Amino acid sequence: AVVTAAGLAWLRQYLNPMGPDTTSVTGYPDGSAVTTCIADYSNTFNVSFPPREALYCTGSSSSEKPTLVDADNYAKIDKWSNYDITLCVLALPMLRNVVMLRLYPHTPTAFALTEQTPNFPQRFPNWSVYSADGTRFNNGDEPGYLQSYVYLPNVDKHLSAARGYRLLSRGITGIFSAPALETQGFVTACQYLAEGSIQSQSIKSDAVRSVTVNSDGTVKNVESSSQTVSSMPRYVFPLDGDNCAPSSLTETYHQAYQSKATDGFYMPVLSSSRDNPFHPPQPRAIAVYGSFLARGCLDPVSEAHEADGPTHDIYRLNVADDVAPLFNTGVVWFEGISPKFSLKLKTRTVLQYIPTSGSVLANFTRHEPTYDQIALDAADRLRNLMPHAYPAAYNDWGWLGDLLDSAISMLPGVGTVYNIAKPLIKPAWNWLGNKVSDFFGNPVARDG
Amino acid sequence: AVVTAAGLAWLRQYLNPMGPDTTSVTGYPDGSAVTTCIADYSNTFNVSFPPREALYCTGSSSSEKPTLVDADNYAKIDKWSNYDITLCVLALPMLRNVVMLRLYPHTPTAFALTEQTPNFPQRFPNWSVYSADGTRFNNGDEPGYLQSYVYLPNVDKHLSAARGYRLLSRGITGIFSAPALETQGFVTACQYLAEGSIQSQSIKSDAVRSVTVNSDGTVKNVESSSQTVSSMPRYVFPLDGDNCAPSSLTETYHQAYQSKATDGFYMPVLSSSRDNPFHPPQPRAIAVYGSFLARGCLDPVSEAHEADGPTHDIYRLNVADDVAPLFNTGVVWFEGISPKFSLKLKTRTVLQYIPTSGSVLANFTRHEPTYDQIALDAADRLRNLMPHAYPAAYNDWGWLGDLLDSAISMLPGVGTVYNIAKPLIKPAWNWLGNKVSDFFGNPVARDG
Amino acid sequence: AVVTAAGLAWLRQYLNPMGPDTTSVTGYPDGSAVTTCIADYSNTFNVSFPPREALYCTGSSSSEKPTLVDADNYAKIDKWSNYDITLCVLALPMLRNVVMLRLYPHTPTAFALTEQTPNFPQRFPNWSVYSADGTRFNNGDEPGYLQSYVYLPNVDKHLSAARGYRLLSRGITGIFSAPALETQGFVTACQYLAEGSIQSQSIKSDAVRSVTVNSDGTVKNVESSSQTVSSMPRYVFPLDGDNCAPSSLTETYHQAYQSKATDGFYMPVLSSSRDNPFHPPQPRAIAVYGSFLARGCLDPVSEAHEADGPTHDIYRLNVADDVAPLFNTGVVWFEGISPKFSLKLKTRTVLQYIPTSGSVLANFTRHEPTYDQIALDAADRLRNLMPHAYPAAYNDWGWLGDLLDSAISMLPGVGTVYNIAKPLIKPAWNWLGNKVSDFFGNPVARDG
């Protein structure tokens, strides 16, 4: 009838992954009664405008040949560096490849993706270039944007030696810096559930056509193999690329975070579900749903037009991973950023493992299968109230825990012992205007 | 600890979509904290025995040619009009194409569907004919039944311009009328969950056979491409067509509704789940599961017979739509109906949208993300007690709301403040015999 | 606010399927308001070392020819009978084919499966041989193990004539016996959720190659049909074959059961979910997920290497069935067993049906759609505390029901009337050392 210490610690580390107090690591409070080891991955990256040495072409140029550095089309990228730029970071529930960074000369109208599969996607220190017309880039084209994946190798090593896994919490911090007289810019951040699933796109086979003109050989196998079949299965994310522009996100989600660029960001990505079961590691090729073009059977048609029905475009990322289901997808935009910027990305991903016999993980097991229903109910209750992001320096929230968790833990059902803990009011996270009030009306003076 | 006004309003509009009091429209009480607009579509159609001008052939006759009107095989349909007829309406959780109407000369033993994909399915005012042998109809055959889809175009327009959607409630009313001395007939109505899913049927490729008889050309590519692959993915509904006859439905489901034809019907279709998350619009070709013929690996066989295992027949509807998941499928039969009938179908579909930036919906947003756990728990509790349908004139139930919702809202958990509201007894919805008693034993005198 | 009698009876029969008191059969307490009949299948099998007459080859030898008895390679199996053996039983949530028996000369390091589809898998009294190198066995090879499926035919007959079904409970008892001075051996048992799903593996088509060398015929159709497509859909179980060795299971799961062989086992397999909805019978080919070999897009590669991504091996069982979703998979090992053993397998499977009109089941319907939220919550609460198995003779647990169910039914929420029922402590199921204490500390003296 009262939240235990383990449940409270899990709630703290789930809602505030990078809270300075969050030193110990605690598992999911479901009493799984399985031998588990909890791994915490803290990584730091220093992103800035890449030099020519770390740029590669995604086009057919590097198709069978390995990655090809840009053949001194870098002059166009310097032209980008003349003016302000835009920097998107997209945190899908990918376990490795924690975030995807993208650099634009100016803010796009949508989060476009290429219909053709890219060539050798590059891990963070290296980038890959994409043309301005939404296609893969070969040398001698018009670069449109740069893209890279931020990769955690230890996560891959540990996922190899694990019977099961589940993501416990994940946070991303974006400490922003720029030269003096160059601090101008804005930052927007949002979270939303993009519930991916294993789907296969509809493709066409090739009909065989033979003309046996021989005197004795007149088979004439004109059979039509050009039927509609299913491609190989991929984990497809229904992220709305066309609606990922910063303005649309700001005006769609109320808990979206907006501020000056210098404030940075701090996204504690959250789960969209009450439960969090273990899953066996099963990496798959990842893809993103697009939009359909031919209406097909959306109108009265014949069988010949059934095949070309509303088939949604599937954008292959050429990246394989196992995703954390029911976890939100985060997206942050830095618009109007000085090209001489420096973003210190800090990621903290804590996840639970069931070790495989004889594996490395088996030497770090930790057997307290604690149970706490109240903590899980409180997490579900709080999912819809927490803002999607905070300023990079805004950690160790006073309202969190002893106040917010206590003031919310006694609504669920009648699981209430203390009569009244504290009234809860609607906060106003107006970081742009310095009129921020927390969940209890206490103003938040600027600590950075 | 007490149901709010918004939750009560949502419950009222979800259980009684066409209650006369239900004027205001309220969203799902989950506190989604997203900008949403709720759209209410009320449509009215006047179905009757169609004339020859609105009848089209579904066979291979209209394969590449557009829809072909019946070549004056209408004499057989007039012969149908000599005697009594049967009228089925099937409400799948399709968003557009709210219902499917079907006209039979006499009651069938099952809800059959054609193995071959039909040609140009017709929206309501036009019908499409199917032969008596369960096949598509070409001119010069024996017509078996007529079929049409009742289509809502505004739903399609709004679904195009939406990031996400969810069905809030849906009701169908069937006000029946017939000439004097022709009011004979019966009406049956039922609801049941047909949990569809994205599946692909198992099909066969075509093996290529070449006989290179040339003196130098003797390749002889006899390779067998005739393997088993997967067709394109479709949303398949596991509706039991073989068990959709009126008698089977009446004797299977206790809450099934039976009455005289003149009573009409009023189906407030219900959800089968506790939750109701937003989903991105994603129309797909719709299909219905059949039954398998070859047992295949259901008996000890070899690999050659694994492919022809228990492969269930999939009936393509040649209609594309996005369905509302976890919502019941309704089916109503009008048996022994005078062919000179007139059914006023009234449909009310209210659903919530997340507007896309710059779209039309964005001009009608409505930001009260209210939360009410008690209302959702009450809906789950009541799902199994509400009858599947009511007489067409039976609206504004006195027992509903202040009595039923109050008398059920205090069982869940111990979320109870008022000591005792009202005892709840089992109703007896005997509309045929005029011995109807509501949930509290109060008799229901005939108001129509 | 108090658990009803029907809910308590369902809980008793779900947690203790073969409790001697469990005579009456009760349905799922959800108030489905559907006509249902509950069928109880109790079956008994006497497994022992098979003779030569009941052994068949799974290799390509019996490909088009029916099952072929071993061509007196039985001498090797007698050599097996010289020493101690190992006997695995694997209870997948298959409805028919309740368990799969497997006989090994010595304990394997993993639960291997053959990449090639076996030929004519044999129902229990007959076995099928597999070679030592993890391949199908033809006559004149090195036998590796024997395998058989324990099949319930009445379940198939009743599933044919049913609109819907759901598994209510399932238990397996393993009464072990051996000659005097031959009782040596150990038994291990475990349960874990292997959440299968309908998936299709990624396969390759065959590119067509024609050389039209004729003077007038020079088509040269060199088109590459060798693309990547999806095979036919199968129900795939993610059971970790590589981690199913007895030691790994013992050290992974805390509730795993270990004892002397003579104790036998008694696995009351449990559900992993709160709910249990009806499902339409839909048998499919069953398969088991393996592990991938080529990393593919797990590293930066090109499009040509996207197809050979992390494609997990799928092991076809050549068996078709409909599975009970969200039910645990059980696995028990008898290691170091005297080859002259005798295992009396007793299976009790009770499941609910919605009868089809005119079917046999319709003559045994039973209409008490009772509802009990407390029972379902108690089942969810208890899922993580019950041990995975008990000694074969350990039935009619005193702590169960009046003590355990009562002592757990008043934690959920505040649905509590009796102030304090009984304190609950952590049991110690040390069957090997005869230091067993139940959930309340009362020692369990050996009753067998």
Add this chain to the structure above:
Amino acid sequence: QYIPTSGSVLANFTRHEPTYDQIALDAADRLRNLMPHAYPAAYNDWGWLGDLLDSAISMLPGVGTVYNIAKPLIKPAWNWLGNKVSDFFGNPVARDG
């Protein structure tokens, strides 16, 4: 009632409560010669049945009587043609159809 053959389809629908009730058997014997051979199609759920008729017939067999008197039993008049239908206890039967 069936006795299921072992392994047959009936064996999955068994119901094990072999109740014993002699008084019901003697009541059935006594009531055989009193009940009419047929009723109108709509004449179901007879009120006189059970708590009145079975009770008024359960104490005569043997001397197994506990309650003093249940209700006097009179000869009914099943005159459906003339709409003068009486009951075993004199209560008139108004036509429900």
Add this chain to the structure above:
Amino acid sequence: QYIPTSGSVLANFTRHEPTYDQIALDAADRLRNLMPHAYPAAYNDWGWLGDLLDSAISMLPGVGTVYNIAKPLIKPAWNWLGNKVSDFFGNPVARDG
């Protein structure tokens, strides 16, 4: 506000609460001549507005007054250039941006 045309898009978003409030209209007319023409871009959510200004002005109109005295109203000094801004009740406005 729109009056929708039949069959138009707007007809799917109607909202029927024809509320009436004379006091609000009179207060708006009264306040038209006191509100400054503009504010700094960051100056939203004025504390004086509503519970203070609207209340302190809603009881001058006519004698439509129930509460005896709400709050005295003084002339503000919107000197944004010199950072000497005082609202309608003399409370200084510290720079929030």
